[PDB]
Amino acid sequence: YGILFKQEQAHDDAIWSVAWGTNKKENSETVVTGSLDDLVKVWKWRDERLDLQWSLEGHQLGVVSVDISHTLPIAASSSLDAHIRLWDLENGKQIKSIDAGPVDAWTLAFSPDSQYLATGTHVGKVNIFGVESGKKEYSLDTRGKFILSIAYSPDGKYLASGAIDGIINIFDIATGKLLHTLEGHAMPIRSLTFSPDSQLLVTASDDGYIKIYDVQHANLAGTLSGHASWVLNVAFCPDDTHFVSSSSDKSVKVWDVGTRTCVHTFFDHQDQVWGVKYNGNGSKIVSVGDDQEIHIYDCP
Amino acid sequence: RDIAKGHLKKVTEQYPDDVEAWIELAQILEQTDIQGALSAYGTATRILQEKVQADVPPEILNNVGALHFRLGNLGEAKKYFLASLDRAKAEAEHDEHYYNAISVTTSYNLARLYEAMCEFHEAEKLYKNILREHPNYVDCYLRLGAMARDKGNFYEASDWFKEALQINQDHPDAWSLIGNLHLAKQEWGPGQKKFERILKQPSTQSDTYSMLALGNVWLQTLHQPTRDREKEKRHQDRALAIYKQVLRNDAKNLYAANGIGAVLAHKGYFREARDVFAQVREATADISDVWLNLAHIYVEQKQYISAVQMYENCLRKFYKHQNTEVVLYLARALFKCGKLQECKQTLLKARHVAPSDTVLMFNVALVLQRLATSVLKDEKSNLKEVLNAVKELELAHRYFSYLSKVGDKMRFDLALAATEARQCSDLLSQAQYHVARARKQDEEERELRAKQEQEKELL
Amino acid sequence: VDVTRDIVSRERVWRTRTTILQSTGKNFSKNIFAILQSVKARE
Amino acid sequence: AGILFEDIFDVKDIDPEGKKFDRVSRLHCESESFKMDLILDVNIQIYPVDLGDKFRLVIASTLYEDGTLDDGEYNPTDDRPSRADQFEYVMYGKVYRIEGDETSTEAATRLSAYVSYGGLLMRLQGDANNLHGFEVDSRVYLLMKKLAF
Numbered sequence: 001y002g003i004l005f006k007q008e009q010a011h012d013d014a015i016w017s018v019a020w021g022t023n024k025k026e027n028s029e030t031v032v033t034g035s036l037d038d039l040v041k042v043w044k045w046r047d048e049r050l051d052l053q054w055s056l057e058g059h060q061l062g063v064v065s066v067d068i069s070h071t072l073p074i075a076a077s078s079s080l081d082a083h084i085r086l087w088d089l090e091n092g093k094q095i096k097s098i099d100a101g102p103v104d105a106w107t108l109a110f111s112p113d114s115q116y117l118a119t120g121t122h123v124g125k126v127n128i129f130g131v132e133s134g135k136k137e138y139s140l141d142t143r144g145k146f147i148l149s150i151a152y153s154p155d156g157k158y159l160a161s162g163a164i165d166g167i168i169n170i171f172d173i174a175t176g177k178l179l180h181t182l183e184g185h186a187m188p189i190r191s192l193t194f195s196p197d198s199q200l201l202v203t204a205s206d207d208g209y210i211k212i213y214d215v216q217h218a219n220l221a222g223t224l225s226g227h228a229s230w231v232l233n234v235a236f237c238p239d240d241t242h243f244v245s246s247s248s249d250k251s252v253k254v255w256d257v258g259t260r261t262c263v264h265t266f267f268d269h270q271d272q273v274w275g276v277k278y279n280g281n282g283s284k285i286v287s288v289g290d291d292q293e294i295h296i297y298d299c300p
Numbered sequence: 301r302d303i304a305k306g307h308l309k310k311v312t313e314q315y316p317d318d319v320e321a322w323i324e325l326a327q328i329l330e331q332t333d334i335q336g337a338l339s340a341y342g343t344a345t346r347i348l349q350e351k352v353q354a355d356v357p358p359e360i361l362n363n364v365g366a367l368h369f370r371l372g373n374l375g376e377a378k379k380y381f382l383a384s385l386d387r388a389k390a391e392a393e394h395d396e397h398y399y400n401a402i403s404v405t406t407s408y409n410l411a412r413l414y415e416a417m418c419e420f421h422e423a424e425k426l427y428k429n430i431l432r433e434h435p436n437y438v439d440c441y442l443r444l445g446a447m448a449r450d451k452g453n454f455y456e457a458s459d460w461f462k463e464a465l466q467i468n469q470d471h472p473d474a475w476s477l478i479g480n481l482h483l484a485k486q487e488w489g490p491g492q493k494k495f496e497r498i499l500k501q502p503s504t505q506s507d508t509y510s511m512l513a514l515g516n517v518w519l520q521t522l523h524q525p526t527r528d529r530e531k532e533k534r535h536q537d538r539a540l541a542i543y544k545q546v547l548r549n550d551a552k553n554l555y556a557a558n559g560i561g562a563v564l565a566h567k568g569y570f571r572e573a574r575d576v577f578a579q580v581r582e583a584t585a586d587i588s589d590v591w592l593n594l595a596h597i598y599v600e601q602k603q604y605i606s607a608v609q610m611y612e613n614c615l616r617k618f619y620k621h622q623n624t625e626v627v628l629y630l631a632r633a634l635f636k637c638g639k640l641q642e643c644k645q646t647l648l649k650a651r652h653v654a655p656s657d658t659v660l661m662f663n664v665a666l667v668l669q670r671l672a673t674s675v676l677k678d679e680k681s682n683l684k685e686v687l688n689a690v691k692e693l694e695l696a697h698r699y700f701s702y703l704s705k706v707g708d709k710m711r712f713d714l715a716l717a718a719t720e721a722r723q724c725s726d727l728l729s730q731a732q733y734h735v736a737r738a739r740k741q742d743e744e745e746r747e748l749r750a751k752q753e754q755e756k757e758l759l
Numbered sequence: 760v761d762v763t764r765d766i767v768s769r770e771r772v773w774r775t776r777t778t779i780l781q782s783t784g785k786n787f788s789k790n791i792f793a794i795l796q797s798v799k800a801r802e
Numbered sequence: 803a804g805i806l807f808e809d810i811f812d813v814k815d816i817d818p819e820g821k822k823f824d825r826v827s828r829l830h831c832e833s834e835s836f837k838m839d840l841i842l843d844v845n846i847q848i849y850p851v852d853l854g855d856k857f858r859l860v861i862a863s864t865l866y867e868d869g870t871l872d873d874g875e876y877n878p879t880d881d882r883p884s885r886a887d888q889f890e891y892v893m894y895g896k897v898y899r900i901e902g903d904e905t906s907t908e909a910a911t912r913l914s915a916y917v918s919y920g921g922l923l924m925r926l927q928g929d930a931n932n933l934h935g936f937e938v939d940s941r942v943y944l945l946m947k948k949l950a951f
Contacts, residue, residue, distance in 0.1 A: 013645070016652065036648065060691060062648055080648065080655070081695060102702040103661070122655070146656055164656065166452075186452030188654070207451045209420065225420045229618060248621050272621055290621070331773045401765040434762045476776065509776045544795075551788035552781040560791075564798060575794055582858060582949050583782035585810065585834060605931040609836055784951045 001264045004284060005296030007050045013037030015288035017107075018275035019066040019075070020045075022238050026073040028280035030089055033288055034063025040077050042089055043294070045284075050294055054092030058085055065107035069114040070154075076131075078108045078119065086131075098134045100127070107191075109150040109159075111173070118159070120147030126161055126171070142169050142178050149191045153198040158215050162189025166205055170218060180218035184211050190232050196240040200257065204231035210245060210255060224260040227251050233275050237282035242299075244285055248272040252287060254299065268295055304328055319347060323360070330367070338367055358388035358399070362406045369413050378417070381410040404430060408440060420447050438464055438471060453484040475499050476509055492517050508546055512555050515542040519559055522566055536563050554580050558589060570597045588614055592629070599632045604639060607632075622653045624660070631663060640671050659710050662703060668696040669723060676731045683738040690731050697724050804863035804871075806935035806942065807926070810834045810949070812856040826922060831857075838928035844946075845922075849891045851948070860889070860945040861917075861926070863935065874941055885945060893944035895919035900938050902930065917942055 013036035021027025030053055031043030040063055042054030060081035068075055074095065076086040082105045086095035104127070106120030116137070117129045124143035127136055142161075149162030152173070159171040166185025171178055187205035194201060194215075201215050208231065210224035229249035236243040236257065243257045252266030252273055266287070274289035285297035305328060311321045326340035341364040345356055365380025384406040391399030411426035424447060430440040445460035458481050464474045479496050482488040488495075496513055504510075518539045522532055540563055546556045561576040574597055581590050595610035611626045627650040631643050644667055651660040672689045675681055700721055703714060811831035821827060825847040831840040840859070844851060851857070864871050865884040886892045897917040902910035913933035915926045924944075926933065936942070 014649075036645065060695060064652070080651065082698070102698045103655075164654070186454070205451075208418070209451065223421065225418055225422075228418050230620070249618055330771065398765050401762065401769070404762070405766060405770060434760065436760055436763050473776070507777075508780050512780070544792075547788050547792065550781060551791070552784070552786050554782055554786075555780050557791055560795065567798075569798065572794065572798060576791070579786055579791060582810070583784055583786055583951055591835075605934075606836075613835055613837075782951065784949075 001299045002297070003266065003268055003295050004048070004298040005050050005294070006268070007043075007294035007296075009292055010288065010294040011035040011037050011039060011041070011292040013039075013062060013292070014271075014274065014290040015292055015294075016062065016064060016274050017066045017233075018277050018286055018288040018294070019068050020277045020279060020286050021068045022278065022280040023070060024280070025071065026089065027068040030068075031286060031294070032066050032068060032075050032089065033275070033294070034059075034066035034077050034079075035288075035292070036062025038062060040066070040087065042075075042092060045296075050296065054089065056087055056092060056094070058094060058097075059083070064105075067108055067110050069110050070112045072114045076108060076110075076117065078105055080105060084108070084117075084119065084129075096134055098129055100129070106147060107150060109152050111152050112154055112156045116173075118150040118152070120150060120161075122146055124163075126150060126169075128176075138176055140169075140171055140176065140178065142171075142181075148189050149204075151193050153194040154196055155198055157198050158194070160192055160194075160201055160215075162192055162203065162205075164188045166203075168192075168201070168203060168213065170201075170215060180215075182213055182218055184213060184220055190230060191234060193235055195236055195257070196238060202234050202236075202243065204234045204245070206230040208247070210234075210260075212257070212260075222260060224255060226255070227253060229272070232273070233277075235277050237278050238280060239282050241282070244276045244278070246273045246276040246287070246289070252276065252285075252297065254285075264299060266295070266297060269293065301328055319351070320344075322347060326363075330363075334367055334370065338364065341367070355387060355390075358384040358391070358402050358406065361387065362402065362409065365406075366409050369409055369416075374413060374417055378410070378413055381406050381413065385410070404434070404437075411440075412443065415443070415447060420450075423447060436467075438468055438474060442474060442477065453481065457481075470499075470504075472499060472504060472507060472509070476513075479510075479513055486520060489517065489520060506549060508550060508553060508555075511542060511546050512553075512559075515539045515546075515559050518542065519562055522563075536566060539563060554583055554587075558593070561593060565593075565596070570600050573597055588617070592626075595629065599629065602633065604632070604634060604636075622649045624650055624654065624657060628659065631667070635670070640667055640674070643667055644671075658703065658706060658708075658714070661699060662714065665696045665699045665703075665720070668692050669720065669727070672696070672727055672731075673723070676727055676734055680734075680737065683741060686731065686735055686738045690728075690735075693724060693727055693731065697721075700724065803867075804869040805860060806863055807859075807861040807932060809836055809838065809859055810856060811838075811840055811859050813851055813853050816851070816853055831859075833928075836928060836932050838926060838932065841923070841925040841927075843919075843922040843924065844891065856949045856951060857946045858949060860885070862943045862945055863941075865892075865943060886943075889945040889947040891944065891946045893919040893922070895922075895924070895942055895944065897936055897938055897940055897942055900933070900936060919944065 015033055015035040017034055019032040021030065029045050031045050031050060033043065034040050038057060038059050040056035041052055042056065044051045044053035059077060059079045060083065061079040063077050063079050065078045073090055074088045076084065078084045082099060082101040082103050084098040084100050084105055088095055100119060104121040109118035115131055117131055119127050119129060121127050124145055126140040126147050128138050130137045144167065145164040147161050148164055151160055153159065156173055159173045161169040166183065166187045166189055168182030169178060170180035170182060185203060185205040185207065187207045190204045190206065192201065192203050199216065200221060201213050203211055203213065208226045208228055210226040210231065211220060212222055212224060213220045226245055227247035227249055229247040231245050231247050233246035234243065242254055242263060244252065244254050246252065250267060250269045250272055252269065253262045254264045256263055269289055269291045271290040273287050276285065276287050278285055283298050283300055285299065287295045287297060308325050311318060322340045322344035326337035326344065329336035329340065341360060345360060348354060348356060361380050362384040365377040365384060368377035368380060385403055388399045388402040388406060407426055407430060411423045414426060415423035424444065427440050427444050430437060441460060441464050445457040448455045449457035461477050461481060465478060468474060475498065479492060482492050496510055496517065500510060518535060521535055524532055526532060539559060543556050543560045546553060550556065557576055557580050561573050564576060565573040577590065577594050581594060591610055591614040595607045598610060599607035608630060611630050615623065615626060627646050630646060634640060634643050644664065647660060647664050647667065672693045675685050675689045700717055704717055811833050813829050814832050815830040817827040818830060825845055826843050827846040829842045829844060829851060831842065862885060865886055866882055867885060895917045897915055899916040901914040903912045904910040910930050913928060913930045915933050915936040917924050
């Protein structure tokens with residue numbers, strides 16, 4: 001339980017997210033991050049070492065969201081410039097640039113089938129663009145304030161969304177309809193993800209409690225006291241035994257999803273961490289943030 | 301207390317079988333330096349073992365852990381509180397000294413610590429274990445509502461806080477907590493005066509807490525354009541009278557001068573507000589208010605060099621990273637190269653946390669126009685930047701159309717975007733005029749490199 | 760009950776609300792009301 | 803005016819390498835707001851400072867408020883109201899060096915004004931914006947005063 005790799009000065013500007021693979025489709029060995037200095041670096045974690053493989057540019061505004069497609073070795077990047085540009089980790093070239101104008105462009109959401117991409121809209125709806133199309137296919141009519149987080153399930157059976165006022169909106173990606181609306185928070189939901197089995201749903205609000213609700217019956221499974229600052233990023237281990245939590249307090253606690261206990265905490269980041277993500281197997285835990293330093297956390 | 305200290309300095313040197321001498325030492329030093337009571341408790345803990353094998357009573361361990369609770373030795377104070385609990389439980393025949401109240405205070409400090417140790421579940425359970433056995437306690441019932449008030453100001457906090465007041469209406473803490481509920485929504489601006497004037501009876505007098513909460517709710521009514529209506533001047537004079545009264549009765553209260561500096565700045569004396577805020581800064585400058593009130597004069601006198609650090613220093617606290625209100629104050633009269641492109645980076649850091657604000661989306665456009673007019677008017681500058689300036693100008697123009705459809709604004713309608721659209725129009729014309737200068741400089745550099753390559757071929 | 764007077768009689772409150780308002784030091788208003796009065800005569 | 807600098811510092815380490823002299827000790831303060839270093843030598847005998855003390859340190863270019871820039875000779879018989887009347891330790895020195903993290907191309911971000919007070923040195927190592935009114939070989943005052951908070 002420690003840190004393996006320590007990437008000093010991983011960017012010119014603060015990193016706001018981090019993406020890493022979990023499959024064997026040339027995704028787990030390459031590290032795609034998006035920082036505010038408009039450098040989409042394609043880091044190749046080869047030879048147990050964080051090497052730069054590609055350096056993609058073109059975004060007017062800093063990168064807001066980076067994620068690796070599940071069934072595909074390609075990638076994409078969103079920002080606040082309403083221009084969501086698709087990329088390829090096979091050539092380091094640009095596929096396309098979805099002009100999600102005028103401003104309505106937020107974090108991305110790769111479908112597990114790698115066929116749809118969800119992106120928040122300022123109107124409160126969740127626009128589902130098509131990966132190879134770029135056009136607005138279908139949009140969820142659940143208005144409100146704004147979508148602050150969107151996530152796809154690993155098997156693709158449900159879909160949630162974090163609003164500005166702590167409103168989980170459990171959608172159905174199989175029919176496109178709002179099923180539940182979980183309002184166990186009044187804090188702006190920062191991020192969330194789905195369990196590897198699509199049974200638990202963590203919510204990273206701005207109250208520092210890890211309220212892990214359920215999706216099958218839309219109910220709370222237990223209030224976990226998280227950090228004292230705001231949990232920014234939260235990911236589950238691929239083998240489904242633990243889950244990490246990024247707050248805004250230079251604190252990398254690794255909570256247990258079964259016992260709700262911190263099994264390890266990192267304090268190597270001088271600043272607040274912004275992105276956390278697991279490896280393909282869950283030993284290496286990559287982490288980014290305003291320290292612009294990519295730490296690789298091993299917990300064998 | 302001076303005589304007790306000077307008497308204790310006499311028992312400290314000599315050793316006439318001192319046993320309780322170190323207790324009376326630390327019993328005075330708890331208000332004074334918190335290390336002195338700790339140094340006295342360390343030795344009083346070991347001086348109670350030489351006469352007999354007697355365990356330390358829980359009463360000493362509870363206070364030594366209480367001192368460490370305020371310190372960074374939270375785990376060590378937690379072991380002190382666990383051991384104070386285990387020792388006070390052993391007092392089955394100490395019914396006169398009431399081991400039960402000692403376990404109550406130790407568990408109270410222990411849940412007070414657990415709330416602070418990133419553990420509200422254990423704090424809730426420990427505070428409920430006091431509620432289940434003694435519902436006539438107030439702090440355990442008040443500290444429970446605070447924990448739920450983090451999740452929202454409409455949960456069991458606003459209910460527990462009013463339930464505590466009906467059982468004890470003469471509790472200035474529980475009643476002062478009531479007005480703090482109405483502070484989430486300032487819609488109770490004028491109407492809060494009533495609920496703040498409840499315990500303004502002479503039996504509670506004097507109470508600086510409430511009188512200053514009045515001056516605060518009166519200052520919040522400033523920053524309005526109706527000052528020529530002889531309305532805000534009266535408000536200034538009223539809050540100034542409040543402050544002069546809490547000044548005459550308390551010269552060492554800092555909050556009294558805090559509002560006086562605010563009004564003198566609102567009167568137009570920034571040259572004379574630094575002097576009033578100097579006494580406040582010097583006493584304690586580690587209050588979030590002074591870092592800002594002082595920073596407005598500095599950004600007022602064209603010293604962003606002394607204003608930008610004052611804003612970063614407030615953000616050094618572990619409560620957020622990217623606040624809106626600071627960064628609003630950060631960009632005021634910035635025109636400099638480190639003050640425009642970098643100001644965009646902080647603006648994006650602010651909109652990253654909540655883009656729903658209109659003023660962030662407006663200022664990101666105003667700075668974008670400032671930068672584009674600073675490369676497409678008198679420049680005659682680099683070539684790649686002429687390519688990049690049009691992209692920024694296009695994004696600013698797309699935002700110009702998106703802002704105009706929004707209903708609510710910054711308490712000021714944004715109908716004045718027309719001058720901005722006209723500026724961006726003539727900016728488009730000047731950019732199309734200068735993109736040709738870009739190609740002229742291209743041919744210039746190509747012929748310079750060729751006329752240099754030929755000189756090298758001569759050698 | 761007696762649990763109230765059993766605890767409010769032995770504990771020690773070194774800090775409360777009004778403590779927070781005054782400085783821990785000695786900053787009287789002779790150096791404050793002086794400028795406060797000088798500002799009113801110039802107007 | 804003429805206030806080249808102004809801040810609150812607090813003694814973080816007193817003579818660390820060991821006491822080299824007897825009436826003079828090194829104070830290694832740090833700042834509170836601008837986050838500057840200070841290495842000061844004070845006459846520890848007529849103005850004693852202990853650890854954890856906080857003082858307001860105003861480095862000024864003149865003593866008279868109007869900034870009328872005196873000559874550099876000592877005349878005690880003088881009516882004019884000074885800034886030294888609200889401080890407790892005033893020194894008078896001469897900035898002898900300004901190091902910086904310049905590179906060959908871009909400018910510097912951290913400066914260090916070393917001034918010398920008749921023999922008793924000082925180094926105000928901060929960032930290159932608060933150290934602006936300091937140019938080498940110029941007369942400067944110290945003006946510090948302990949905060950009893």
